[PDB]
Design a protein around this ligand. Structure first.
Ligand SMILES: [Cl-]
Ligand SMILES: [Cl-]
Ligand SMILES: [K+]
Ligand SMILES: [Mg+2]
Ligand SMILES: [Mg+2]
Ligand SMILES: [Mg+2]
Ligand SMILES: [Mg+2]
Ligand SMILES: [Mg+2]
Ligand SMILES: [Mg+2]
Ligand SMILES: [Mg+2]
Ligand SMILES: [Mg+2]
Ligand SMILES: [Mg+2]
Ligand SMILES: [Mg+2]
Ligand SMILES: [Mg+2]
Ligand SMILES: [Mg+2]
Ligand SMILES: [Mg+2]
Ligand SMILES: [Mg+2]
Ligand SMILES: [Mg+2]
Ligand SMILES: [Mg+2]
Ligand SMILES: [Mg+2]
Ligand SMILES: [Mg+2]
Ligand SMILES: [Mg+2]
Ligand SMILES: [Mg+2]
Ligand SMILES: [Mg+2]
Ligand SMILES: [Mg+2]
Ligand SMILES: [Mg+2]
Ligand SMILES: [Mg+2]
Ligand SMILES: [Mg+2]
Ligand SMILES: [Mg+2]
Ligand SMILES: [Mg+2]
Ligand SMILES: [Mg+2]
Ligand SMILES: [Mg+2]
Ligand SMILES: [Mg+2]
Ligand code: NA
Ligand code: NA
Ligand code: NA
Ligand code: NA
Ligand code: NA
Ligand code: NA
Ligand code: NA
Ligand code: NA
Ligand code: NA
Ligand code: NA
Ligand code: NA
Ligand code: NA
Ligand code: NA
Ligand code: NA
Ligand code: NA
Ligand code: NA
Ligand code: NA
Ligand code: NA
Ligand code: NA
Ligand code: NA
Ligand code: NA
Lengths: 53, 132, 337
RNA sequence: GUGGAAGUCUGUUAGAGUUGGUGUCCUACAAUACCCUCUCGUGAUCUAUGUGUAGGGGUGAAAGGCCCAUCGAGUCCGGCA
RNA sequence: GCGAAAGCCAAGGCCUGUCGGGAGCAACCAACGUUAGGGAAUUCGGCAAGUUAGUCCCGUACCUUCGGAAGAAGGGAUGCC
RNA sequence: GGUCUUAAGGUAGCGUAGUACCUUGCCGCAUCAGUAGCGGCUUGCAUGAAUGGAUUAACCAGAGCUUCACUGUCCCAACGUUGGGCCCGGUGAACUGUACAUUCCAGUGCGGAGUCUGGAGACACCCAGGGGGAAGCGAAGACCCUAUGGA
RNA sequence: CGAGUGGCUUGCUACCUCGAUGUCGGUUCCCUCCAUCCUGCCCGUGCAGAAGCGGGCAAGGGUGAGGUUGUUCGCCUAUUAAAGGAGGUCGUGAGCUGGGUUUAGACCGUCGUGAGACAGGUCGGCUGCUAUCUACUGGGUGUGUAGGUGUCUGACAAGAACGACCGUAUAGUACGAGAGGAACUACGGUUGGUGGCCACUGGUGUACCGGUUGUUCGAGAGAGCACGUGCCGGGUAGCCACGCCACACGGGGUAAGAGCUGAACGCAUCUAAGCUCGAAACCCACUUGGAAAAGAGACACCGCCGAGGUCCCGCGUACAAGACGCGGUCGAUAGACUCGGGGUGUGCGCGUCGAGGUAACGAGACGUUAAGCCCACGAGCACUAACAGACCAA
């Protein structure tokens, strides 16, 4: 699997899946991502993110 | 009951205000008890995903208000652990009013529902729109 | 009315004092069923990572499916039965009769024992056989020790010595089985005793924590509400009633917590391999790198990294063995982050 | 719009007061203290100095409050062994 | 900055709110920070703690001695160049 | 009852009252559940007119209650910060002390014993702890009675 | 109607304390009783089944959460297998709380000429002490057994280390007109308790990195202060729980009970002798402690002029002193350095762009730059420091 946020591979037997109001699903590899997301930041704008890379 | 097929960390307590995920006319529900649960001195009775709880209607249609019904926990904010290790949490806490046979008192379930709930409450599950 | 409530903490693991031997000592041994064999082995705790497995349970509705399971890695390099100890049955229980040793000794076994220079193996053997002839021969166990040197991550070189029982078919047959192991050089390994899939009992001396309060030590509550601001936060209400006018030993009080021996029951042996397949990226925090004979134990094991832990075929298993479970993945991801 | 009244409002301005924490202390720093909290803060205001009222007497927006750690009758010495 | 406010800093004063050395410095206590999910279930009682917050714009109920209630409530804005 | 004591015999109001014994009075609101709170009823043990009655905007570190918000008050505790605490140098008290004293379980005794009786247990010393007991220390009991006491 | 037992209530008594044994309720923490609420094994039934009702053995475990009231009690809700009762100075203030009781202030009603009174109501109204002895939790030093190392034994001691529930198959079966509706057994899960652990999730993380407000160091760069982090964002290790792992079965003997054989009493009889079964209770099993078990233990080796140990040095898998454990050049114990693995989030400078502005000037954007900075972990590495050496010992 891949982190629906930064884009790096999510080490199996790890991570969190958030379930949105509408029913959308967002797997996260770590709290770091989760938290950056809650800030309202987008993975694209974060240079450390595989996505942005 | 039947194994949920997932480990749960109750995210609710006696007295907690949750969401009524259905079209019964009940908006807000207040937990009053947890079926088959006995606690321990000083501990508040705790509820979570897949628990049949006793509830009382806080908000909704005048006719539905103040009514003491039975319901099921379809979603919670606190994480739960699936067999593959991953955790799963939702956007809010929600329950769907149920009857004696465990059949949704309503017609339609608003919002998603954990899959694990299926393995316990068929008729509730078979009424779901989205099943994560 | 005062609602009821169980007492805080068990009165079964006491007194809660510091352990006498960092090296654990079983007080129980498996039953003499199968063929003759050594009833135990040891290793040195290294750390934790998860493994993905195929649901091996025939009764699981998920049998055959993927499944993540926590595993504590333990380095279990070969050990050496340096001598066979014999016990005799007497009106006062069992007593050590004699011992048959060897000549081939690990280069550093003398960092612990006053290694033998002149021993009569046969005479001992004879004495034993005469006791068995007379029928006063009590069970048989091998003095064993480890080779810390063999484990780089573990500083100690001084080997840890512990006696392990040998249960076998007949006494005569296993007595022999014993002697043979010894005579060689005593060298044996985890493969010789355990098979991946079986259940074992893991003993160990827990992680020491020094002196701690009752709250932590016995799990009593902290003062609640207004009481928590009066000058007492983590001390119990009282040491006892007016009468009897003495403090009972059953009341939770401060003291040594941790560094206690514990024999944790029914631990499933996920896999017994060798190499660096289990090691983590960056190295096992406060331990090192693993690259040699190792055992993967399901869940947790008592003790901190580097501590000696002892194995033994579960004496009271609940499930039937389910040999060699399919390991589909072992995480090597770094334990830092 | 001007004007700028008020036993007026906010306010740790200064200053005065002392509600809760029943915290800290409780052989104290202190024979009434420390901290946070809280009240008043242009007025029947607060304050220094001087000065008047003396013991069944003063003084008292009254609590039997206060009159030099002393008050339902100060303190000292005497009556008094 | 509204400010004799905070906070930072001069001038001037001080290191005398006058015993020190050492242990990642344990339990316990005093002050205190942060705690997931729930959110007063605690308790005689929300005690303690917390929330709110400055300024401008909009907007503001019952009641009223028409003075007030009122900063009611609620909504928005707020930096730098 | 359809007058009598003793002059009159409770009017306007208010009322289960900070006044109501019966009492958690009854009905309602509110809550899952409310000896609470509020409203109505009210025969008021034993309300009521300057012994002021009713009522009331504004004000209140005054008493009770509800809601939103908030939160370690709680579920149920964790980790951390600073000063102590612990070890070392220096300084250096007080409380308290009939004697003896390693106690524990019972018994007995002026009926609430480390010291009596019977048993049990118990090698000596030391460090740290939270305070079960010494009916622990502190104060010739404020309660109660007594005194041909005081004020 | 009659006989009793208990010592929770109340009453009676006035033995004990008035040179004070701190009065309610609550809370916290510990032990106990059984007249048993649930759970185990049973008997009867107005026992079809299911659900009950009554009774027996039995105290192992459990017996919970909330609304009014200071309340105890109790009233009420919803859960529950059940939400039992009582003793411990109505256990527990050198533990807490202080709502109530119970001082001094005040109001109301009643009573009184009045001062003032009322177990009538109401608002407010203080909680002292540095532990000598004893007791217990943990920690050390000595002596005894009578040189050392290592391994054991096990008298005894502790445990609830486990208690309980739901679900599935059995089965829509037995039973029953039907409605309704079991079990033995095998499985899966929950809960409460217990012990441990930290890969995973989560918390902390005043290590660290960034953002940014005020001010001061002339600006810049880089910094200090704003309580012992100014605030905000992220967060490694470790410690944790809200996270994760583990916690039987089965034997033996019994109770109530069901029976066998069996006599007194030719018959009968579960009992009198004998025997077979049979409780969550008892014993074992299992976990923990345990040579100071005065019968003060056993074995193997090493040693008595030398085995071993202490001090010393580098450190911790240990730790309040003390103790414990590891390493000490025949070396990776600690540090430096370099890698690896990690945390932040893209450094200074310079170049280009930049709303504009004559110009000065210019917030900011992009590039260089997964950069800069940083690490309580691992590896490599004897470079530095584990040197020198002291002592005790049959
Ligand atoms: Cl409940
Ligand atoms: Cl408490
Ligand atoms: K008395
Ligand atoms: Mg991760
Ligand atoms: Mg409680
Ligand atoms: Mg206090
Ligand atoms: Mg990690
Ligand atoms: Mg004014
Ligand atoms: Mg003011
Ligand atoms: Mg004057
Ligand atoms: Mg008076
Ligand atoms: Mg929280
Ligand atoms: Mg409450
Ligand atoms: Mg309560
Ligand atoms: Mg407050
Ligand atoms: Mg009323
Ligand atoms: Mg009149
Ligand atoms: Mg005696
Ligand atoms: Mg007296
Ligand atoms: Mg008096
Ligand atoms: Mg008089
Ligand atoms: Mg006393
Ligand atoms: Mg009985
Ligand atoms: Mg018991
Ligand atoms: Mg009492
Ligand atoms: Mg009690
Ligand atoms: Mg006291
Ligand atoms: Mg006491
Ligand atoms: Mg004290
Ligand atoms: Mg009071
Ligand atoms: Mg009161
Ligand atoms: Mg009062
Ligand atoms: Mg600072
Ligand atoms: Na205090
Ligand atoms: Na305090
Ligand atoms: Na007492
Ligand atoms: Na005008
Ligand atoms: Na004050
Ligand atoms: Na006088
Ligand atoms: Na005189
Ligand atoms: Na009157
Ligand atoms: Na005032
Ligand atoms: Na806090
Ligand atoms: Na004591
Ligand atoms: Na009696
Ligand atoms: Na006395
Ligand atoms: Na009490
Ligand atoms: Na019981
Ligand atoms: Na109650
Ligand atoms: Na008492
Ligand atoms: Na007190
Ligand atoms: Na009390
Ligand atoms: Na049995
Ligand atoms: Na001995």
């Amino acid at each position: 699997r891949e982190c629906d946020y930064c884009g790096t591979d999510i080490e199996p037997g790890t991570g969190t899946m958030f379930v949105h109001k509408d029913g959308a699903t967002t797997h996260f590899c770590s709290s770091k991502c989760e938290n950056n997301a809650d800030l309202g930041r987008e993975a694209r704008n974060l240079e450390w993110t595989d996505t942005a890379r | 009951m039947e194994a949920l097929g997932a480990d749960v960390t109750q995210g609710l307590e006696k007295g907690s205000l949750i969401t009524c995920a259905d079209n019964t006319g009940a908006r807000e529900l207040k937990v009053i008890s947890v079926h088959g649960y006995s606690g321990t001195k000083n501990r508040h009775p705790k509820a979570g995903l897949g628990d049949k709880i006793t509830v009382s209607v806080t908000k909704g249609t005048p006719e539905m208000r103040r009514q003491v019904l039975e319901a099921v926990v379809v979603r919670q904010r606190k994480p739960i652990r699936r067999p593959d290790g991953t955790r799963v949490k939702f956007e809010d806490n929600a329950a769907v009013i149920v009857d004696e046979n465990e059949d949704p008192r309503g017609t339609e379930l608003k919002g998603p529902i954990a899959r694990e709930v299926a393995q316990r409450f068929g008729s509730v599950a078979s009424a779901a729109t989205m099943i994560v | 009315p005062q609602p009821s409530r169980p007492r805080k903490g068990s009165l079964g693991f006491g007194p809660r004092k510091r352990s006498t031997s960092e090296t654990p000592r079983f007080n129980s041994w498996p039953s003499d069923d199968g063929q003759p064999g050594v009833q135990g082995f040891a290793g040195y705790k290294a750390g934790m990572t998860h493994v993905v497995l195929v649901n091996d349970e025939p009764n699981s509705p998920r049998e055959g499916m993927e499944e993540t399971v926590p595993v504590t890695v333990i380095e279990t390099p070969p050990m050496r039965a340096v001598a066979l100890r014999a016990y005799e049955d007497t009106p006062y229980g069992q007593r050590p009769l004699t011992e048959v040793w060897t000549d081939e000794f690990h280069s550093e076994l003398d960092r612990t024992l006053d290694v033998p220079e002149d021993h009569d193996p046969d005479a001992a053997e004879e004495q034993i056989r005469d006791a068995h002839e007379a029928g006063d021969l009590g069970d048989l166990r091998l003095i064993t020790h480890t080779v810390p040197d063999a484990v780089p991550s573990v500083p100690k070189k001084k080997p840890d010595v512990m006696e392990t029982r040998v249960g076998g078919g007949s006494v005569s047959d296993r007595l022999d089985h014993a002697l043979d192991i010894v005579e060689d050089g005593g060298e044996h390994a985890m493969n010789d005793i355990f098979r991946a899939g079986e259940y074992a009992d893991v003993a160990g001396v827990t992680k020491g924590k020094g002196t701690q309060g009752p709250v932590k030590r016995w799990g009593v509550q902290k003062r609640k509400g207004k009481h928590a601001r009066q000058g007492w936060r983590r001390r119990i209400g009282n040491l006892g009633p007016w009468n009897p006018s003495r403090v009972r030993s059953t009341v939770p009080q401060q003291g040594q917590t941790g560094y206690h021996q514990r024999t944790e029951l029914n631990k499933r042996l996920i896999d017994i391999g060798e190499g660096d397949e289990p090691t983590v990226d960056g190295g096992f925090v406060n331990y090192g790198e693993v690259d040699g004979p190792y055992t993967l134990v399901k869940g947790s094991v008592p003790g901190p990294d580097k501590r000696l832990v002892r194995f033994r075929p579960a004496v009271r298993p609940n499930d039937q063995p389910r040999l060699d479970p399919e390991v589909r993945y072992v995480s090597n991801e770094s334990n830092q982050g």
